[PDB]
Each structure stands twice: as structure tokens, then as C-alpha cells.
Amino acid sequence: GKVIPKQEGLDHSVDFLREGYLFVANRRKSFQSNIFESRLLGERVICLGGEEAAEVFYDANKFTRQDAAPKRLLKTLFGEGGVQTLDGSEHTHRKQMFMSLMTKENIDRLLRLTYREWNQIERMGEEIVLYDIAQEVLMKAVCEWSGVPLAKEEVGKRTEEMRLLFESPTYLQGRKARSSAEVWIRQMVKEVRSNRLLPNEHTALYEFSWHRDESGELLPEEVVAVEVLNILRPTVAISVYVLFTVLALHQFPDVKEQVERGEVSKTEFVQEVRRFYPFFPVAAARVKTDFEWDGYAFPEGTLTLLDLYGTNHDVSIWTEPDRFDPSRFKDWKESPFNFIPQGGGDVDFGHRCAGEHVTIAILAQVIELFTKEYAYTVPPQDLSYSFVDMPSLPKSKLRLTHLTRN
Ligand code: HEM
Ligand SMILES: CCCCCCCCCCCCCC(=O)O
């Protein structure tokens, strides 16, 4: 029989913009609570953080993603009708559609495509901006991987579009991008179902354009365009983690040397990059019907936020969360709720991120290239990144000089 700590005032949206990734964490410390209530986007909002609130937030008996995501993110970042917006058996079936791609062999294909693209950054020369090059590498690799025709002369435009999507006046700049992208891919989709274009099996455009939902029926063309965009867009967004991974290599020379000696694996270095650096701030959902957790009352329909970054730095879960220390993962298996940079819960039956294996494999290959394959200088520059602006980026965008093969 407890009261949920409540912030006074009519609107805290401005405060959420002011404090970004530190909003939930500042209030969890301030209140000394894993739960509190704010007002934003016109509504009462319940905020949560930590292992046990995470396990509750991913309890499908208690929470629903139906109408959870705000319509403006549907407009710019997520797409309408996507797997994000789905329920029960329908969601399980479509989520199995995404997971069919994440086989080891199909990811191997992707990683061969990224290696081949990366191999050409020796082309550009003695001075690269890593964020730009990463985006273009990833865009060409993931377009190829998904059977998506991407001509050379249009690589700037399409990669730019995906960037405005995952970085979403600028609001409707991102809106315009989403529209352009969606008709591009919708176009290609109808050329697939009418045999004017023939993408390979085990690619997203092929397997999605042909997908039969649980009725036995193909999906609408715009929905297919959305589901493809939910692979193209976040793969390019991996560029942010590329920046943070090379930054980690430069910022923590001792762990870099432990990576090169094999004391810590590449996977573990990647995990600690995803835990240490901010990227996705909160997941969202809605109380299904009135329930109680921990003596607290959740009213039906209440929008609810789970703190991903904050949970990843939770001092009750992690020893010295503020130290970059990949050895914290060796040998340590995470639960599905204590380490959640790309969502919590079970991937196949919950809304956890589809692309985690892809993310980790691409970042591990980056560690290999930027320690063993290439040599380079990091000149003095602004390598700081924001805790309040979303998403966070090292300011200089990682300017590398004197980049030569080892
Ligand atoms: C190749 C790269 C990626 C792919 C293909 C991908 C794909 C997806 C998909 C399909 C979903 C919806 C899952 C569902 O509704 O069941 C999702 C959600 C999500 N993704 Fe990823 N993503 C990628 C990269 C990333 C990156 C770089 C981040 C950075 C933090 C991230 C974090 C998340 C989070 C937090 C969610 C929501 C979890 C939730 O709603 O419970 N993903 N992703
Ligand atoms: C309620 C979610 C607010 C997110 C606002 C900041 C955007 C950072 C997330 C970008 C991650 C890219 C992955 C994706 O494209 O789906």
C-alpha cells in the first residue's frame, strides 16, 4: 500500500529534454525509488528502473505495447504497423519472421559484406571522419545483405535518410525521409511480388515481401516497406556504437592491450561498450489492466517507461558501473532483465531487439579492424559526448588521420 513518488508541476517534457539519459536516473536517486511518476506528452507517465521493474515491464500479462509508442516516433523513427506495434500471436509470428534472418549463416553473409566495404576505407585517405564512413559502409553492406538495390550515385542520399531517421523543423525533415524511404522500398516490394525483381532467399526484402501472416496471407506493401526499414535503419545506426567502440579503444589503452593479448574477448569488450555508453534511453509500454507490484498500484492505460541506460548503470546490479571493465562479463551470464541496452526479456516471445547478434558481430569485427588491420592517429579533438542530448555522439565524430594498413 504505497504511493508512487510524484513530481509536482503540470508538464515535465521540458525536463526530459533538459536531462536526457539522466532524467530517470536523477529521479530514481532523488526519490530513492525504482519507480516514480511524471507528466509528459500530455499524460501521466510511470517511470521504472532496475532488474525487478524490468522483469515486470516485460511481463506480457501486465503490459502491452498496443498504442505504447508515441505517434511521432511512429511518424519518424519506427514506422506504422511494424513489429513494434504488435500483440500476442500476431507479434510472435512476425517476430519469428525477423528472427529467421538472424541465423549464423545469414549473419556471416552480412559480415562478409561489411568486411568488403570496410576494406575500402583505405581508399579515402589520410583523413577520415569515422561516423560518415561507418554509415556508408553499413548502408551498402545492409542494402546488399537485404537484396535491396542501391546504386552508387544514390548512396549519400539513402544513407543520409537512414541517419535522419535514427537521429529523429528537423522533426519533419525526419518525416520526409521516412516517406521517401518507404516508397522506395514499397516500389521494390511490388516489383518482387510481380517478378520484375528477384532478390535472393534468406534476404529481408525477399522473405518479407513473401511473408504469410498467421492467416496464410501476404502483408500490405507499406507494412513490408516498414519491416525492411526496421532492418536498414538500425543497421546504419550501429555507426554510433562504431564511434563509441573506437573511442573506447583510444580512451582505455589498458583494456585495448588486454583485448590484443586475448585476456578479454572481443564480445566482452562489445558488451561493455553497450553497457557503458548511452544510446537507447527508455523502452515504452502501457499497463494492460489495474495491477499491483511491490505495493504500488499501476492503473490501466498508464504509459510506462523502462530506463535502459539507467538500469545498465545500476549500482545494485553492477560493481563500479562507472568503470569501463569488460572483465565484468567473464565469466558472467546476464539475466534477460539486468543488462538491457537493446531491450530486455525473451527475444522470440517479447519485444526485445531483433538485431543484437548483428550489432555484436559488426562491432567485434570493428575491434579487429581497428586494432589489428589498420593503424591510425587520433589528433587532438573533442571526443566528449553528451549525457543529455539524444542520441549521444562524440562531438568530433571521430576524426582519424594517417590511416594505413598494418
Ligand atoms: C542491425 C541492427 C538492428 C536491428 C536489425 C534491430 C531490430 C530491431 C527490431 C525489429 C526491434 C523491434 C522488436 C520487437 O518489436 O519485438 C528492435 C527494438 C529495439 N532495438 Fe534494435 N535493431 C538493431 C540495432 C539496435 C541498436 C544499435 C540499438 C541501440 C541501443 C537497439 C536497441 C533496441 C531497443 C532498445 C529496442 C526496443 C526494446 C523494447 O521495445 O522492449 N537496436 N530492434
Ligand atoms: C521513446 C524512445 C526515445 C528514443 C529517442 C532517441 C533516439 C535514440 C535511439 C536510436 C536507436 C536506433 C535504433 C532504431 O533505428 O530503431
Spatial contact of 62 and 298, defined as CB atoms under 8 Å apart = yes
What type of residue is 343?
Answer: G
Q: How far apart are CA 122 and CA 82, in angstroms?
A: 38
In order of 165, 246, 307, the CA distances from 263 in angstroms are: 38, 18, 32
Name which residue sits closest to atom 43 of ligand 1, judged by CA: 353
Q: Which residues on neighbouring strands pair with residue 36, listed in sequence order?
A: 47
**Shortest-distance atom of ligand 1 to CA 274:** 30
**What is the residue-wise DSSP string for 295-322?**
TEEE-TT-EEEEEHHHHHT-TTTSSSTT
Strands 63-64 and 282-287 come out as: antiparallel
> Quick one: which of 317, 347, 311 has its CA closest to 329?
317
CA of 282 to the centre of ligand 1 (A): 12
Query: C-alpha grid cell for residue 200?
Result: 535472393
Long-range contacts of 338-343 (CB under 8 A, 24+ apart): 338/51, 338/54, 338/311, 338/314, 339/271, 339/275, 339/312, 340/54, 340/283, 340/306, 340/308, 340/311, 340/312, 341/274, 341/275, 341/279, 341/280, 341/308, 341/309, 341/312, 342/274, 342/280, 343/283, 343/308
Name which residue sits closest to atom 14 of ligand 2, judged by CA: 234
Spatial contact of 110 and 141, defined as CB atoms under 8 Å apart = yes
**Residue 47 assigned as binding residue:** no
Residue showing cell 549500482: 315
Spatial contact of 18 and 390, defined as CB atoms under 8 Å apart = no
Q: How far apart are CA 148 and CA 188, in angstroms?
A: 8
Q: What are phi and psi of 327, to 5 degrees?
A: -60, -15
Query: Among 231, 353, 390, which is best to mutate for testing ligand 1, by the most ligand atoms less than 8 A from CB?
Result: 353
Spatial contact of 66 and 87, defined as CB atoms under 8 Å apart = yes
Q: How far apart are CA 252 and CA 257, in angstroms?
A: 9
CA of 29 to the centre of ligand 2 (A): 24
**Shortest-distance atom of ligand 1 to CA 237:** 27
What type of residue is 151?
Answer: A
**Residue 353 assigned as binding residue:** yes
Residue 391, ligand 2, Cβ within 6 A: yes
Exposure b/e, 192-204, CB count within 10 A at least 16 = b: beeeebebeeebb
Helix (H, G, I), strand (E, B) or coil at 404: strand
CA of 240 to the centre of ligand 2 (A): 11
Q: How far apart are CA 357 and CA 362, in angstroms?
A: 9
**Shortest-distance atom of ligand 2 to CA 70:** 1
Q: How far apart are CA 46 and CA 400, in angstroms?
A: 43
CA of 159 to the centre of ligand 2 (A): 17
Domain at 208, CATH number = 1.10.630.10
**What is the residue-wise DSSP string for 51-76?**
HHHHHHHT-TTTEE-TTTS-HHHIII
Determine the structural domain holding residue 255 and report its residue range. 1-406
Q: Measured in whole angstroms, how far is the alpha carbon of residue 32 from the centre of its chain?
A: 29
**Shortest-distance atom of ligand 2 to CA 391:** 8
CA of 285 to the centre of ligand 2 (A): 15
**What is the residue-wise DSSP string for 338-385?**
T--BTB-S-TTTS---S-HHHHHHHHHHHHHIIIIIEEEE--S-----
- Total number of domains in the chain: 1
CA of 166 to the centre of ligand 2 (A): 6
Tell me the ligand closest to 94's alpha carbon: 1
Q: What are phi and psi of 38, to 5 degrees?
A: -130, 175
In order of 64, 202, 343, 356, the CA distances from 100 in angstroms are: 24, 8, 19, 14
Query: Among 59, 165, 236, 342, which is best to mutate for testing ligand 1, by the most ligand atoms less than 8 A from CB?
Result: 342
Residue 234, ligand 2, Cβ within 6 A: yes
